[model samples]
Target: MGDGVLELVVRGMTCASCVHKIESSLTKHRGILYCSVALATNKAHIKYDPEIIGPRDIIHTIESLGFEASLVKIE
Candidate 1:
């Protein structure tokens, strides 16, 4: 993965619909190559271009979709 890769927790996805909403919103952006969302954990793995998409913007995108989200740290 790229150094710009980030994992985050996205809240508000109670069902498959919410997941689709978030995924669709993120994909609308230019830099995001792909994303994986986990409904059980409400988390996501994202790959994007830092120059085009920043961590903060990504978090905001998640939130804008009516979900609460935050950055993921190294475990």
Candidate 2:
């Protein structure tokens, strides 16, 4: 599997719970290796297996949950 790191700018987070929800949701995803969302910066840094998932899916996943998220870059 291919591993990837992504940086995303997230919007509409109100508190710590928002961060918790996003982080928990992403980590449970099939290809996600790790997920961390920061409320302060409205950023989410994720490590995933690209063979199983793509960054666009991740953006859609969160946005579908009523949050605004977009890919900033990938590494």
Candidate 3:
């Protein structure tokens, strides 16, 4: 019953508010369990339900929040 975790590079986050924006957007989604953002490296540690969410949607969410994301790797 556990979810999957993914690590990716998040770009275009220029301020503290951008982190909040990304966090809030993920919170609004149903499958997202947790989201950790790095302001220095601009990376995101995202845990979500695979059935309802995918990397593509995650990337879209980031873009919608004025940020960018790429699947550099998955773990």
Candidate 4:
């Protein structure tokens, strides 16, 4: 399958450090090619391989890091 782009609404991030933490964790995941967390907007944009991961899984990954996350869109 082709790469998928996912937008997520993430909550509980307070500053740039949180963004870095989230981005770092996501980039380490097997399926994720890129990750950007915007603290100001409380959003995360991710490029991942759909064959290896899905939207719910991505959300779960964020939540596992002690944040609230939900699907905003998939492209």
* Pairs in steric clash, model 4: none
List the candidates' TM-scores in order. 0.83, 0.85, 0.83, 0.84
Number of clashes in every candidate structure? 0, 0, 0, 0
Off by over 4 Å in 4: none
Q: Compared to the true structure, candidate 1 yields what TM-score?
A: 0.83
Error of 2 at 55 (Å): 1.0
Local error of candidate 1 at residue 45 (angstroms): 1.1
C-alpha lDDT of candidate 2 relative to the true structure = 0.80
Better of 1 and 4 by lDDT: 4
Error of 1 at 39 (Å): 1.0
lDDT of 4: 0.80
CA lDDT, candidate 2, residue 53: 93
Candidate 3: stretches off by over 4 Å: none
Candidates 2 and 3 compared: the better one by lDDT is 2
Candidate 1 ranges with C-alpha deviation above 4 Å = 1-3
lDDT of each: 0.76, 0.80, 0.78, 0.80
Q: Give per-residue CA lDDT, model 2, range 1-75, as digits (tens).
A: 347877788878888888888898888788888888866678888878777898889889988765888778541
